[PDB]
Amino acid sequence: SVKYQADLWFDPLCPWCWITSRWILEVEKVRDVEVHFHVMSLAILNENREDLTENYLENITKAWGPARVVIAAEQANGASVLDPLYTAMGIRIHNEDNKNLDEVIKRSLADTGLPAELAAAAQSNAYDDALRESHHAGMDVGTPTVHVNGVAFFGPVLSKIPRGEEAGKLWDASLTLAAYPHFFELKRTRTEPPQFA
Template sequence: MTPTADFWFDPVCPWAWMTSRWMLEVEQVRDVKTAWHVMSLAILNEERDEHDANWQRKLSLVRVLIAADQNHGNEVLLPLYTALGNRIHVEGRGFNGAGVLEEALEEAGLPASLLEAADNDKYDDAVRKSHLAGIELVGMEVGTPVISVEGSAFFGPVVTPAPKGEAAGKLWDGVRLVAATDGFFELKRTRDRSPSFD
């Protein structure tokens, strides 16, 4: 049976976007299938951040993702995330870009009526539940993405550009190895470049 890797993302994070593209490569070269879940940087940082327009927009995006998941099934999250990520990150339109959410819904084959979730707190409990399901696996000191597979959970990897082919598989093997090592917590170095979306 193919193992499942649970992947928690916030669509505004460029590093989560890079990791998600790597994970899609991993699926091509390793026996693993990814299940996609929403987490929220707005919620993670809500005690530190001012609840300004940017904070509200971040929350709006994840509300729509959760509404899509609940009303149309988990299988719609990846196409919607991909449509959002291409606009936000690859095209450089940002998460406040005009038409980004509307266009992404259309590309993913989802109804425009999901836009109603953006400014509605109806889905906030579900957003928090999904967010906490991921963050509680790794602790409150990390962000997005979070990946869990076969009893191991970790933040990251934070990498650019996203490795392709067997290079993606080798990184997966190494990350799983250290994540499954009892008592292992962290490898880190200073980032010296921005995400490369090529």
């Protein structure tokens, strides 16, 4: 009987955004929770950070690609397209460990009935400012970043997807802490890789 309105920022490539986004969709089924997704690029966020030793890799990784396509998709079809397109990408990138992003993008656009042409946005910088705009909206960096009922938080960082009522009980606890304006942090060292089953 407590109503929640949630906005969650995701990068299709991010394993943590994926788990936590799947968790909140589990929460939707056992709590009065409405979820609205927004796309971010982690590659664009860290564009400002200067670590020269990582440059060789980022430029062949093309980590900006999926986020660019998804925001290009949204611009052409509105927000209704985010959830199906994200799920189609995420199942591939994460559940199935498919790191051929050209393939993931091509197949996910097709699965969702979007024009194949949108795949070209991966190589274009024309949506980067839109993406930076999305970042300013969500951030004031967390994986994922979540606004619920007027308050913002990073996480919860989960290494596995909680299901059903367990997912809900963790929602209740997370939001109790988040709703307290003088709460800032609860953490421990991460000892597990993300698992997607």
